[model samples]
Structures are given as C-alpha cells and as structure tokens.
Target: SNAMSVQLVKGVNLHVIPTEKYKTVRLLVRFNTRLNHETITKRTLLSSLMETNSLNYPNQVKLSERLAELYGASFGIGVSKKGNQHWFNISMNIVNDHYLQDSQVLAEAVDFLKEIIFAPNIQAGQFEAETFQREKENLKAYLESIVEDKQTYASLALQSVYFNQSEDQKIPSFGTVAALAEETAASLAAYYQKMLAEDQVDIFVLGDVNEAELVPLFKQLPFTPREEGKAAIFYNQPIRNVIEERTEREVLAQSKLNLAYNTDIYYGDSYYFALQVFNGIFGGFPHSKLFMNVREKEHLAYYASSSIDTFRGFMTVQTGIDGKNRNQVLRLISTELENIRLGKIRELEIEQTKAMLKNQYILALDNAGAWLEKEYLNELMPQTMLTAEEWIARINAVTIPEIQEVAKRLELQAIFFLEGETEND
Candidate 1:
C-alpha cells in the first residue's frame, strides 16, 4: 500500500500506510537523538526499561496482562544506529478490530503505548531502583557477550580501528562498557525526560484504518516543539593515506580477516544505486565475486561477503580462514576488487545481481514491518524517497560502466585480522 505522511505537531509526524493487506495493524514510535558516547548507554537502558514496565503496569506480569487484554498484541523496544543518529524504536502490533468482536482494540493499543512512554515506573525523579539496575546489568552483559561471536567481534573491531577514535561510528549502537559504567538511575531519568521532550518523534501506523481517526489519536502524544539539529546524516571522511592494520591473537579454530574500504558514495549520492549494484556483483550475493572466488573457487576461506554501510559511505569485506592463508586470502580479495575497478566483470553476473537486488526489494512489500521501516527511513531522508517501482527502475537502469565507475572510487581504509592462537606459535 502507498503511504502518506503528515506533521501532527511540530517535531512530531504521523505516517499512515493504508492497506487491507494484513489482519493486523502496526504502529511505531521512534525517538531520534544524536549518536554520542555520553548518552548512548543511557538510551540503550532506557529502551529496555520502557519495554519492561510502566507506572500503572508496575511489572512485567501486569504489562503482559495489559497487552493480553488487547487481544494478544506484541510490544517491544530497541536501539539502532543510522549514520550519526541513534534511534529508540518502540513498536506494537495488534489484530485489526475488523477481525475482532470489538473495534476498540486499536484505540486500546494506543493507550497502552502512551502509558509505557509517558508514565514509566519512576520514583523520586529516578527510575525504580530494581528496574534500573536490572536493565543496566542486561546492557552490560549484552555488550560483554559480543566477544563470543567472532564475526560480530571482528566487524566491531574493524569499525573501532577504521574510524577516527572520536567519531560516534566507533561506538556500538548498544553502547560500550565505559559509557554504561557512568550511568546512574537519576542520570537515566533525566535523560529519559529530555528524550521525551526533545528528540524528534515519528509515529507510523500501517493497517486497515481511517487516517482521519489515527492522526488525532497520535496527536495526543505529548511531544514538544523542538528544532531538529542541522547535522549531516552521512558519515564522511577523506581516505587515510596509510591503511591501518591491527591484529589480535585469540583462542579460536578459525581466524577472521576483515577489510574496510571507503566508497565515497552516500545514500542519496548519484552513484548510490550503482554502488548497490556494484556491491551485489562484488561480494554482496553468494554468486558474487568474494563468495564465488574467495570461497568456492580458491578454497581460501569458508565464508566471505561484502556489506555496505550506505549511510556512512563505507564497504566492509569479512571472511574466516586459516591463519596461514591470511596472505593468500587477502591477495585473492584484492585481485577481485581490482578486476571490478577495471570493468572485468561478466555481464551475466552484473545482470544477475541486479535481478537479485530487484527481487529482494520486491520481497520487502510482503512484510508489514519491513515496509514500515522503509517509510521511516524516508522520513529521515526525505530527499532520497523512491517508491518500490522507482527503486526497481533505478536498479534496472544501472549499467556496467556505472558499476565500474563506482568500483573505481573505492579505496582501502583499514584491515583487521583476528589471528588464531595457533598463529602466535
């Protein structure tokens, strides 16, 4: 279904995606703030605490009971990083009243959200001690657990080493231990209040609903008028002259080798779609160069793929291989990249990757949440709006020379190798 957005209040918006596609109605409340070290941890914990309970609910049991009253609606909160901005996303999905005996389920669901957001279980200007401490510990444990997954660990390591130490890109969206340690119940409460009043708010609803009815209902949310900062959303920096290299020995059977490159192509840039197609042919798909050549043909690695941070204009290639084959793997990866820069790609592979990309874009329409996500992103990047049809047309229009031009702009930025313990011997 096509979507329409309206500014319900200054610094608050309502995007309604009218559809009879699903039996459920989906609503999202997103809070946007700058991604910085000082407040990220607090925001992370705030999301957790918001979902756990509210003043009236008082605990998980009561909260779950309230949701159950709304015909088994689902509610959740999470944090995500987009370029230099961080988002606290709260979502609810409920069965549309058309499928229910009562038509008030949608209204009740909105009330539940208001309760969770505005009436959190705070006492004495601070979050309740137990809830505060519990979510803090959970955030700490989750941050610590990053080490257990090699791929995630390696990717984070590359980001930390690749970006300037002061940049927010170096910090995980979930936050860091250094930041988490500085948070207190009182401090978090202050941040939570500020978040409600100051952060840009976007409310999205998707389902079989009357837009006239939903706008006034969402306007009830107490978001204050505040100016959104004019900060650049795309993370950009000149390529470093000397590529940085870092290696850490860890006790593991497989070693992870990751390479980061600057593509100089941000989300709305002219070459953006070309780079999307470029990534698909280079290492994005299983049939692409990195996967086909590095893993299938050369047998140098078991897993290899390239992913682009479209918001940040960076591309990263990650793979796991024997420590002894690190050099060979690196060489093969470099060769493939060079081939792309020289326009040596097969037309069949290029056409296939475009088809694959188009197919994935089409698939997103089948899921309500995915559709809402794209709509929210469009809110953030209004200049880059494109309907699914427009997107498919652009992907189809990307030619080989355009992909090659995108490839020619890529420059190596950093290499992070997590050497296996055996390599130290």
Candidate 2:
C-alpha cells in the first residue's frame, strides 16, 4: 500500500509499487496537460489511433495477436479529465513471469508499451490514412449521437450552463462533434508531438516488481524533460451572477432534472472530509435525504442522486420524474441542502455517513484498480495519498458542526430540465 516515487527526468516521474498481492503485473503510463479546446479534439483522436494500432502492430487484430502471445495479456488506452487537467492513459496487464518457468513476459510487456507510446502507426509525418480516416469518422458519429440519451444530454447541458464563465470547461472531456469535424490526420500527428514534448509524464508499475531493476528498465523509454509554470491543478469557478436555467421538451416517458452547485471547497481544502460526509448525508447514499424525501416519501421522483467533483469545487443533483412533478421535486431537493446547512440533520445521519465513508475507503484496498487510481490522482494534485487507516480516522473524526459549516458554502448555480411531452398518452 506504498509507492516509491522518483523523478526519472525533469517532468517525467517513475513510480514503482512492489507488492505480491496479485499474479499479474500492472502498468500505467499517463500523459497529462492543461484542459483546453485547442488540443482536446486532437488528443481524443490521437488516443483512438494509438490504441487502434502501433507502428509494429498495424491493427487491433494484430495487437490482439501479440497480446495473446504474452499469455493473453490485457492492453488498453483512453482519455480522461479532472477539473483543470486532461490525461491520456495507456495501460497493460500481463501475467507474472515468476509463475511461468523460463519466461520473460515482463520485458516483452514493457517493450510493447514503449512501442505503443513512441512509435505509433504513422506515414510521412502523419497518421496512416486509412486508420485515421476510419476513426475520425467513427468518433464524429459517436459524438454526434450523444444526445440520443436524454439523461446524458441533460447532465452535459447542465455543465455547460453551470461553468458558463469558462469556455474550456463547457466541453466534455471527449471533444464535441463540432470540434471533431475539422480534425485531420496530419493535424493530430503534429499535436501528438507537441503533447509528447510538453506533457507531464508518469509511469507506474505495480505487482511483484523488482525494485532495483525498474529504474534502468524504464530509462529505455524515450522521455525528455519539459518545465511548466507550476500552475495549480484544481479549477475553482466564481459563483454565477444568476442561476442559468434551461428547459427543453422532448418526446419521452420520463423527464430529467439536473442542478449544479458551487461548493467553494477544493480537494485539498481544510473542510474536505466534512464536505465528503455532507454529500453522503445529502444524496450520495441510498438512505440520503434526497432519495428518501424526493423519491420515496413524496413520490415526486423516480430516482434522485447527488455527486460532487472536489477537483472542481462543485456538486450536482440529478433526478428522473414525470414532467408534471418538476416543481415539487425541485423544491424537495432544495430543502435537503437547506436542512444540512441549518444543522437539522439527525444524529443517526451523522453516524451513518461517517460509518459508510469509512467502510467505502477501507473496502477500496481490496480493489487493485481503485487503490492504484487513488494513488495516481494524488500525484496529479501533488497531494498526500493517505493510508486506509488514516482515511478511517479522518472520517470518524468528522463532527456534525463541521458538516454543516461546509454545507453553508453550497450555492445553486444552474439547472437543466429535459421536459418530456405526453406523447405516449
């Protein structure tokens, strides 16, 4: 449950977690940069192309064949965002060679990743024409089709209106259809080089790794140091002047209601743990006030939930209900936030939230994916990664007064309603 980290180069980090808990060796190579429109589309497209084929492996079929040769190892690539940062992650999981006598799967797996990162399928300073063309069209169609899901559409629309001040934050982590339209193979290739040179790179290896040999092995990958302006990783937006609300009618059976709030509490803030418990009591859990009041007691909503983004200092409440019950559902949701701020919560609520939060963090230790990701994100924020025991202590120490104090900062910012017409009736 500990990570030994070092700066292999100026901006490139090497983290090796040596543990014998699993029979497979897991590796994560993450490339991080600022989130902006200039490269979001290109970065999204590049991720697809890199994952689709490498220079040595010309297609996914060929790549799958190579993985199968390495005892059916699993390889994947994707893009994600956290507040002000965007990241491209390439990962591979291979069988522990220690289990197979006279096998060198670790070395082969590392080599495979290096090729995927450095030598993508390119021709004449551009991506291979056929592959690029296919993925570009594929992505464009997918992005255009996002609104087919009413709930997703309402949530994304809510973000745009919520983060109205920041143009960059309005778009999804995956670029929009309009942005994806003008992309070309040559343009993405050029952006790829820029990303490689400028991104803050981190490589992680977990599971039964030999500590002394990892540094020398990782040095084989071509990574150059690049300095940044030392910007803070978290993004905090100013409270909006007025609540930006949008309502659109659609032919459907259920209506979607989404609301955004400015909480003014970032990830590393002093009041963070209290806010975590506040959210749990508000709507994060099944027994939360929102679910119990809006969905069960009043029967105004089919489902209700709340989630927070500490990296962005924001929270959102989402509900599905009949269009006729919109006003009642909204009123009930608002009351729950007020109840927390007014310290009207029962002692049972406080104990339940603290106990649940402690159990959640404690349980993550058994999930390698969850455990490793928590450690990786800690590095991005440059925040201390707490031990599971430390987390439990912090959660247990959260006072009811602290929860209400943090809840006082929550301010409604925007709302998006997908109104459903009485078409079926």
Candidate 3:
C-alpha cells in the first residue's frame, strides 16, 4: 500500500512497490508527451513496432519464442490519452523468481524489457521495413474500424463537438487516418528517437523483488536527462457562448444519446469530493437518478450512465434509446439535473452512493494493476494523492448542500445523438 519514487534522471522517474501478495512480478514503463496531431500517429505506430521486434530479437517469431522460453511471460504495449497528455505504456509480467528454480527470472525479464525499449530493431536509421509496414497497416485498420462500434463512435462524435477542434484534443489517442497516412518508416524512427531523448519517462516495478537489486538493473536503460516540461497537464476550456447540438442518422437498431457538460471542477480542487458524490447521486450508480428515472421508471433507454473526467473538468452522460424518444429522454435527463441542483435527492440515495464509492475504493486493493495505476497517477499528479481510507472518509463527509453546490456548476455544453435511419431513406 506504500510506494517509493525516485528520479533516475532529470526527465525519468522510477517507482518501486514492494509486495508479496501476487504470484507474478509486473513491470510497466510509461513514456509521456504533450498530445499533438503531428506525433500522435507516429507514437502509436512506434508502440506497435516496439512490441514486435528488437535488435536482440530480429523478428516477432524470435521475440515470441524468447517469451515462451521465459516461462510463458506476457508482454504488450498500450496507449492512452489523459487530459492533454499521451501515454505510451510498455508492460511485462513474469512469474516470481522465488517460485522458479532458476531464481534469475526477474533479472532476465528486466533484460528482455531493456532490449525491447532501448535496442529496437532498426537499420539505416529506419525501423525494420517489414515490421514497420505491417504495424502501419494494422494501425490504419484499427483507426478505420472505430465506426463499427456504435458506443465508441458516439462517444468520439460527442467529444468532437464538445472540445474545440483547433485544440487537438478532438483527435483520438490513436491518431487520424490523414496523420497516419503520411508516416514513413524513417519518420517514425526519428520520432521514436525524439521520444526517448525528450519525453517524460516513468518506470514502475511491483512484486516480490528487492529494490536494491532492481535499481541498478533499471539504471542500465539508455535514458538521458532533459529539461522539465512547462506545459500545463490539465485541459481547461472556457464555456461556449451557446450550447452545441448534433444528430446524425446511422443504420442501426440502437440509437445512442450522449451529452457533455462542463463541471469546472478539476482534480485537487476543494470541490472535488463533493463533485464525486454529486455524480454518484446523479447517474454514476444504478440506484441514482438517471438509471432509476430514465431507465427503470420511464423505460426510455436500455442503459443510462454518466462518468466524470476529473482532470478535464467534464462529465458525459450516455444512453442507448429509441430514436423516436430522443426529445423525451433529453427532458428526463434535464429534470434529473434540475432535481439534484434543487436539493431534492433522498437521504437514502446519498448514503447508498457514498457506501458504493467506498466499496469500489476498498476493492481496488486486491487488484495489482489498479493498485499500481493509482500510485502512478499519484506520481503524475502528486497533489491528487489520498489513501483509500482518506478517500472513503472524504466521500462520507460530503454534505447535501455541498453536493447541490457542485451540481450547480454543471453547464450543458454539447449534445450528440446517433439516430437510427428511417425506412424512407
């Protein structure tokens, strides 16, 4: 439940969590950079290439064979968008050395990661052509397939209208087709070098491992120090002069209704805990307003839920409903928001929400990935740190008036509806 963090170099950090609860050791290396249109596609492709081959293992067959030799270890690369930052995560998991007779499995796992990241397969200042071309096509296919999922497509459409298109936040974490189309093996290789030299780096190790031994092992990575970043990590947007609305016709049985609201409450703010409770009482839980009223009583939607992005100061409500009920559903949603701001929530609803939130926090302790991610967020934003007990206490301390006050900050920003096509078409 405790973590120790150190700056391995000026731009690189190392976090160590010593625990014996898990049978396997996990290592995660996260590379972060400011989100930008020019480099997002390149970064995404680079992550895929990094997972495919390395200088030590020239092809995926060799890499896969090596991992199989390492007692069937698992390794992968993942990318995510957090506020204005893009995170590229390389993760590896292997059985604890104590369980293996070799007792050097941990060291060998670490070496494998070092090879993949610091010594990727490249020739003539370009990524290996076959691997690079295959990943490029894969990324392109993935981007093109975004429209196949109605919920994901609807969420993205909402964001496009919600955030200013000029800000680059409008783009998905996986870059656009236009951006990906221009990337060549040479260009991505150059971007990869830039990422290694300049981006913020955070390395995490969690399992039954000695910190003293692992520290020197991680120091072997080829990381160079760089100047500190000056860009604000949080995304703050001024409220629009007028609310925006968009409705598009798609040929599907289920229509999606998505709404975006500006809450003006970012992480580390005094109103954060109240906002959390407000969301829970609003639409975050099955017992709350949106689910009980919009789905259970009115039966206007199949699922109604809301989630908040604390770092970005926004809340999104989404539902699957009949296109014909769009107007009625919107009115019901508005009524729920109005009721909460008017302090009309039942006492039982508040208590139930707080209890559920507490349960979720307590349950995260049993998950190694969740536990390490919480600590990583703490390292990324130190001011947001709170023990699970402290978080539970804060949730319980929220008052009805405080929740109402937090709800009052919510302003409707954009409404996106994916309507089903009519037979007339």
Candidate 4:
C-alpha cells in the first residue's frame, strides 16, 4: 500500500492492489486534466453521465439491466477537485471474481468501459440530439439544487470569493451553471474527442484477484504509448497573491466565515511538517486555537477549525457564528492567527497536535480504498513523497520555532461570510 505499483496497459494507468480484506472489488478509471476555468464545468457534466448510455447501453434503462445481470454491480461517475487538479472519475464495484460463477464479469466490465469511452452516442459527427439534451437538463437540475444543503452552499460561497479576482480562476469543483449553458452537442463532441486523446488516465483495481490474470485484461484496452512529461503540483494564477473579501446572503442559518491563506510552500518542502502541526494547533484539531477559544471558552461558535492543502500551498480557517456578531467574529479569527505568528501557542498544545496527527495518519491506511489514494498522492507530489510512517515521523519531529516560522509566512488570501438574510418564501 505504501509503494504505488503502476503498469501502462493499452492507454490506461493500471494500479494493482493485492489486499486481503475484501468481499467485493472496486475498479476506478479517472480522466484527469489541468484545464482552466471555462472547460472545467462542461467536461465535468459531459463525462458524468455521457458514459451512461453508450452504443451497447444506449439508454439508462438498458444500462440498469446490465448492472442487474451482474448481480447488482454498482458504479457511477464523480467529479472532484484535488486542489488545482480536476478529475472526472468513473468507478465500478462488483463482487470479487471468486464470488462470481465465471471470470467473465471482469472481462465484461472492461468491455463496459470501452463502450462508454469509445462508443458514446454520436451520429454523423454529432452527439445524438436526444441524449445530449436530456443530460444537459439533468446536469442543470443537479447544479441548481446545490443550495438545498446549507454547509455545501457556504463552502462554495467561500471558494467563489477566493477565486473571483480572476474570472478564469473562479470555477468551483463541480463547475458553473453559466458554463453548462454555453455547451452545444456538436461542441461537446469535439471536446469529448480531444479529452479522450489528451487527458491523463489512471485505473485502480482493488480485490482478491491474481495480478497475472489482471494485468493482461488491462493491456487489451486501446491506449497508445505516449510520453507525458513529469508532473508537479503548483497553482499558477493571477490572484494567487491577492486576498479577496466578500459577504454573501443565505437562509435559515448561522453566519459562517471561511479564511483562505497562502503558505507559499509546496508538498515536499522543508516546512511541510510544521505546517501540518500548525494547522492542527491553529484550529484543525479539537483542542487547538479556534475550538478551545471560540467554541469551548467563549462559547460563540458551534464548530471552528482550519485545514491545510499542501498541494496548493493554502490553509483555510472556517467557523460558524451568530448572525448578529459578524464584526466581533471576524475580529476574533484575525487575532488567533496573529497569536500563532507571535509564538503565543503553548508547547503542550503543539505536543498534543503532533500526537493527534500521528494517530490520524496511521488510521488512514486501515482502509484499502484510502491506501490506494495515499499511494496516488505520493506519486502526484514526487518531491514531497513520504510514506505514512515517514509522515508520522516528520510530524513528530516538528519544533515550536519551526511552527512560528511557518505561521509568520502565512498570508491572508480570502475572507468569505455567508450571512443569513431574512426573507419570506
């Protein structure tokens, strides 16, 4: 699980997992890209269900039937943002090959992927008009309905402020509704074809299967051998240095504040461990700054915390507060961050955070799916690559002075408020 074992077969990045704790198998395929703000939304929606009705299963009903025949094998596509990277991922989970009556399930699943990727509904150089319209409507409904959940809406609002200085950089992880509106069937087809050829692909397989049998099944896919250059994790944008400020309106909720800051350090940098522990003491852990002061002592917020995204060199502090105290709340958050920079954090707090992080790091590897990602992240940040054990050692080795140094370098990049506006429906 610590070392990422990869083999290029056909055109897919095949990852083999030989773990023992599974009654089922999960196969993942990811189409990854470093696209700018505009194409991010269209590519996300098009890929999500574009594979739902391909030539073999040219409609949702037929696709459901195929899954039923495989004893309720479950799978679907998901879109997510890993810092600056966006991925349109498709995943399938079926009973392990041992449980099935034959090895045909594995073969059929591979064929299913081919059908989705290669034979997407198209006629005369255009995507089928009906399928295209139906998917567009569905995607629009899903995107608009995001506000049904208050927490999600708040976070999105925060990111909107964080990315807004540059319109090209303001895209949310799922993407924008306006961008979805601009897509046409013909344009999508052109984009789809380009993506199939240009985007990076990675395949993950976790199950009780033989590598000897699994490797060749992957080799059968149609991928050309092309050399993609070495990858690095860096966020290049015009607003990367500026701090954005905004206040937004929401309904029936507590006021929320999201603070974004730049650490200016990449994943494998020397101050990485210090940043990790610093985040915990600043509010990431329950016993840290915000929670101990804002929630436990002052009793102002129900929850308050901070997190670090090492890949993108960003740290965020989030908190929930009463609507009437927005000014007081904002001031309190600023003071705590200043405290850390001044080395006011107690040695006992730093020691406790280190212990908390070590336990958390070890617990992450207890799951097979998590182990897969742990390895994938290591590969993504080569210079920063460190196994779980190594990470634990690094966290344990952090010093008080190093934590202050990292804190001093922190720059406020954004401050977003989701304020509740009284309204009658």
Candidate 5:
C-alpha cells in the first residue's frame, strides 16, 4: 500500500495510507509532549486511558453501545515511548464504505474520536471521580509490576544509567510513579488543555477508501489551524563522561548489567550504515560477539545484547545473569567493548551484519501497518527520507573498515547493575 501525509493544522499532522484500496481503515492519533520526556510520558498515559467514557457516553455502557451501533468496529487507546518522545495513541479499524451499508463509517469514526478527545467524561471540571481514581491506580500498578519481568527490568535499569535523567532525552518512556502521584484531576485537565494547544498531533488512516471524500471529512474537525513550530527531536551533544560500574540490589531471579555509549551518530547520517554493522559485531545478532562469546561460550548470562538508539546517538549493551556472577559479567562485557575498539572483528562479520540489515528492511514491507508507520516517522523527521530500495542499498554497502571507524567512536558512558536485595526473615 502507498501512503500520503500532510499537516492539516499548524500543530496537527495527518497521515493516510491506501490500504486495500479503500475497503478498510486503521487510524492512529498521537498527542506528544513538548517540554521534557517525563512530562510527555505522564501526559501520554494519563490522557490515553481517560477515554473510558465521554460527556455523551458518560460511562462504559454508553461507550459500548456506540461501538456496537457502529458495526463491530474496533477502537482502543494506549501510550508508547518512541525514543525521547512519548505518544498517546488512539487507534480504530473498520470496514470501508464499499463493504458497509453506508459511506458514513469513516465520518462517524472521526466524530467519535472528536468526542473522546474534546468531551471525555468530565463533570464540574473534574474527570468522572471513579475513572480518575481507577485509571490512576491501574497505571500505578503497571509501573510497579514491571520490575517482576527481568528482561524489561534490565532494559529499564540500563536506560536509567545510560542517560542523564535531568535531560529531556533521558526520561523513561513511562513517566515515574512519583510523578504520576502529583496528577490530580484538575492538574491533568490543565495538561489536557495544553496538549490541545501545544502538542503536535498525528492522525493516521490506512485502508481502502475514497481519498477525496475522506480528506474533506477529516478537514471538518474543529482544529484551530496554527503554524508549524518546533518538533521534539534529539539535540546533538558531546559524548558523556564514562560511567564507572554501579550496582543495585533487588530481590529478583537474575542480576542485570547495562552499559551505555555515545556514538555521536544520528540515524540519517552518512555513517549510519557502518554503525548498523558495528552493532551486529558488538552484540546485535545471534552470531554477535557478546552473544557468541559471553552467553554461549563463557556461559556468563542467559542473554546478552548490544543495541543502538540512533534517535539520540546512544548505544547500549545489556545482559542478565545470576546475581553471584555480576562482577565477572561486567568484566566480560567491558573486555568485549575494548575488543571492538581495538578492531578485533573479522571482515566477514561486517558482511553478515550488512546482509541482515538489508534483508530486514526489505522484509518490513510485507506488513502494510509497518510500512505506513515508517512513512509517518519519515514525514515527522527534519530531513529528506530514504525510499525502501535506497535504504537497503545503503545497508548493503557498509564495509568492515567503515564499521571499525564507527566502533572506535563509541564512548562508554554508564554502567548500571540491578542488584539482588538482601532479605532475612
């Protein structure tokens, strides 16, 4: 399927993809925070689930009644953290007019979306007291439960140590419990207002539908048209200071070791291809150094990986192991980094990484949803985008020496250990 996107209002972005030539529709809306990552994260979570009811629906029963009336259409609200930006996303999937009894499926969906956003269940300036209480508790419970999942915990801990929390780019995708506690109904409603005024919006529709008719229907929304201003993206900064080994103890099944590095490379940079290969040699793939040597050979941990976050020029190495072996794991991970810095990987390893990257990009096109989402991001970026073929070609051309150059530039910035808590009955 092909895609098209444009900014309808100054801060409101719209995306349309011709999925199935207009017979089905998938839509997504993102309300992003403009100040710091934490603010955006909390806003995303709070504002997302508030759609449990609306002024018209007023409760879950009425909301369900509307959905049934709309012919088994699907709708949901959720939040996601993309790089340093958090998004409150709303999505819906529905059969197109050709399959429906009338051409009004899309129009009604848009109106329902408007009602959810503009008139959520509120009485006297407060969200319905029950919803406000329940969603807050649920969100808090989710935050607390995350630590029970080791892989997720390891990644979150790695992130905390990897970046400076005070920086906008460093905040966790889920704003913290301490932060969430301060959100009273009044404060959150104020934030909701700010979102409407300041935050950027992306409304994506994918399906087989008449673009000409669909376009006008979307235009009818009461968005106060404004001018395009600053979007939330990473700012280039110097490589941060090397962080020494830090450890914490928690009562958990396994201990984690996370290492952070500064690559000084952005996603669309000329050196981007080389860095992708560098990641594979360091730890990205199953055949990577960390996995092959540390996890498979030495049996240091059950899992070991290195990942690159090109959005903010950051790289990370993460592993999980028995708590007793934490020191050995850290030493092994450090040694691997030094190896990469010393140009130790074989040329064939670089070739494999390049092949892997090229194949993955081509494979992504098979999913219509993935393709549409990628196009949306490209539209959001400040630079010109790469076509699928162009992106694959760039990955294929990366060389061993080029990867070595990238490896040398990566600077270790932090080490975080999620420690096992000492307990006695």
Candidate 6:
C-alpha cells in the first residue's frame, strides 16, 4: 500500500502507510536537527530522561503499570545520527482497536505519547535531579565499558582514525564521555526547548488507517510553524593520500582487525542498489567473499563480515582472529577486492547476491516496522519511494558490470588492528 505523505506544517510532516496486513499500528516520530558536537551528548541523555519518567507517570514502574492497562502497548525513545543530522526518535506500538473491545485503547496510546513528549519530570526547568544524575552516570559507565569488547573497540577506533578531519563525524552517534560530562540537568532542559522549537519533525504511522481522522489528533502536538531547514543527508570525507593503519596490543584470546573504505554512495543515488549488491557479494551475506574465504575456508578468523553505511559513503570489514593471522587475513581480503574489481566474479555469485537482495526487499511487505522505516526514508529522500515490484525489478536488474564498477569505487581509508597476546610476545 502506498503512503499518504502530508505536510502538517512548514517544518512538520506526517506519513501514513495504510494496510490491513498488520494487527497493530506502528508509529515512529523522528525529530531531526543539525549534527553538532555541542548538543550530541545532551540529545542522547534526553532519551534516557524522558523514557524513564514523566510528570504524571513518576517512574518506570508506574509507567509500566499504566501501559499494562492498555494491553501492554510498547513505547521507547532513542537518539541516533542520520548522515550529517542528529535524530531523536520515539517509537510506539498499539493494537488496532478494530479487534479490541474498547475504543479507548488507541486514544490512550496517543495520549500517553503526548504526555511523554510534553510532560517530562522536571522542576524549576531542570530534569528530576535523582533520575538525571543516575542516567548520566549510567551512560558514562556504559560508554567507558564499551572498550571491554575489543570487537566494538576496533570498529570505533577505526572511526577515530578515519574521521580525524572533523569532530562532528569523528564522534559516534551516542557521543563520548568527554562530552557527556558537560551536560547538566539545567543545560539539558534548556536544550530540549531548542529542539522542540527548531528541529524538523516527521511522524510515521503504518497500519489500517485513514488520514481524515488522524490529522486533527496529531496536529494537537503543539508544533508551531518554523523555517524549513536545509541540511545534506549524505556525508563523505576527503580521501587520504595514504591509508592510516594502527595496532594496539591487549591481553586477550582473540584479536580484531577492522578496515574502512570510501565508496561515495548515498541512500537514494542511482548506484545505491548496486552498492547493496556489491556489499552482499563481498562480505554482507553468509556466502560472501569475506565469510567464505576468511572464516569458512582458511579458518583464520572466528568471525568475519562486512557492512556498509550508505549515509557516510563508507564500508567496514570486521574480523575476529588470532593475533598472528592478521597479515594473512588482510592480504586475503585485499585479494578478494582485487578479484571483484577485475571482473573475475562467477555467474553463480551474481545470481545469489541478487536472489538474496530481492527476497529481503519483498519480505519487508509483511513487516509493519519495516514498512514504517521505508516510508520514513521516503519522506526525507523522495527518490527512494518505490513500489515493491519496482524495487525488486531494479535489484534484480543489477548486472555484473555495475557491481564491478562499485567494487572498483572502493578505496581503503583506515585500518585498525587490536592485537591479542601471543606466546612469542
């Protein structure tokens, strides 16, 4: 089913995907603002603050009690960086009242979301001191403890080296402890006002629905008309003269080797679908080059896989392996890229990549969450709005030459090796 995209205001919009395929209504609200080092941490902490307690619902237990009354509706808030912008997202799922005995269920769910957004637990324009202090410390410890997982550590470490040119991109979406310390309860509360007034808001609803009855209810959100902000949705860093590589030794059983490459592809670009196919053949799928060659055949790695971030125009390959096999793994990976770039792929490889990609695309029709996500992306990047048939056709149409072109577009940027302890050392 196609979505009805409507501009509720100059800076606010609503996306409705009408379908009876799902029993529940999935709603996602994304507040978009420019990405900046100054507000990233505060923006993250707000999710922890508002999700825990609001003015009427004092704490999580009370909130859960209220939700249980609504037949266990789901509610959550989170923050992430989208391309060059910051996103604060709120997700809520409520059963379609058509099957329920009570007509009040849908109304209650919407009301609950409104309360969470407009009525956080604050006094004198500051978040509840106890909760704010607790969440801040919790996030601080969580970020600090992330290094304990060397696999994750290596991934973020690669980001550190690759994005050294800009602090805004250098830091991860959740932000770092250095900036986390700068957020006070008062400062965060003040920043929340700025977000409400300035950030562009988009709301998505997917289920059996009609826009006529839904518009008035959503317009009650109290969003004032504001200037339409223009910010790029794609990010690309300048290519470095030489690939920067680093190695850090630690006492552990397994080592991690992470690599980054620049592709300059964005979500709606013509070659974006080709990039997906290239990633699947290279390292994204189970039968991909990295998985089959590194983990299955040579047995040098415990796990090896690749993933691409189209927003950032980069892809990363991550591997967990023995300390000494690092060089062999690196060389083999280089060879895989070299072979693909040289148009040396098999017919079966292309068939498998296209089959998997097309299957995944078509299967999203059965999932309301996936439907909402795709529609939201379309609202922001209209070029991505395509019917399922059109999507599968384009994916199936990707040829060997297109994939080869994308493979050749890849250029190594940064590599980080987390070396483990060895007997020789």
Best by TM-score: 1
In terms of lDDT, the poorest run of 10 residues in model 1 is 226-235
Segments of candidate 2 deviating more than 4 angstroms: 228-231, 381-383, 423-425
Q: In model 4, which regions exceed 4 Å deviation? A: 1-12, 20-23, 148-151, 165-168, 210-212, 224-227, 230-232, 236-243, 249-253, 423-425
lDDT of 1 by residue, 1-425 (tens): 36777887677778888988889999999888887877788888899988999999999999999989999999999999888888899999999888888569867887898899989989989999999899999888998898689999999999888886556778889888878898988998999989888888888899998778887777776767876553456777778899999999899999999999998888878998999999999899988999999999889998999999988889999999998999999999999988998889897898899889988889887988898888877767777888778999999999888988988899998999999886453
* Per-residue lDDT of 124 in model 3: 79
Tens digits of per-residue lDDT for model 5 on 230-265? 455654566655565667777876777778888888
The candidate with the higher lDDT, 4 or 6, is: 6
TM-score of each: 0.94, 0.94, 0.94, 0.87, 0.90, 0.93
Q: Tell me which residue pairs clash in candidate 3.
A: none
lDDT of 2 by residue, 24-123 (tens): 9899998888899888888898999999998999988898998898888998888988889888989888889888777788778878888898999988
Q: Is candidate 4 or candidate 5 better by lDDT?
A: 4
Candidate 3 residue 313 Cα shift, in angstroms, is 0.5
| lDDT of all predictions | 0.87, 0.86, 0.88, 0.76, 0.74, 0.86
lDDT of 6 by residue, 254-373 (tens): 989999998898887889999998999999998888888989989988998999998988999999988788889999999999888988888888789899888877787777777777
List model 3 lDDT by residue over 204-247, tens digit each. Answer: 98998777888888888878897666236688889996989999
Off by over 4 Å in 6: 422-425
| CA RMSD, predictions in order | 1.9, 2.1, 2.0, 3.2, 2.6, 2.2
What RMSD does model 6 have?
2.2
Least lDDT summed over 10 consecutive residues: which range in candidate 4? 230-239
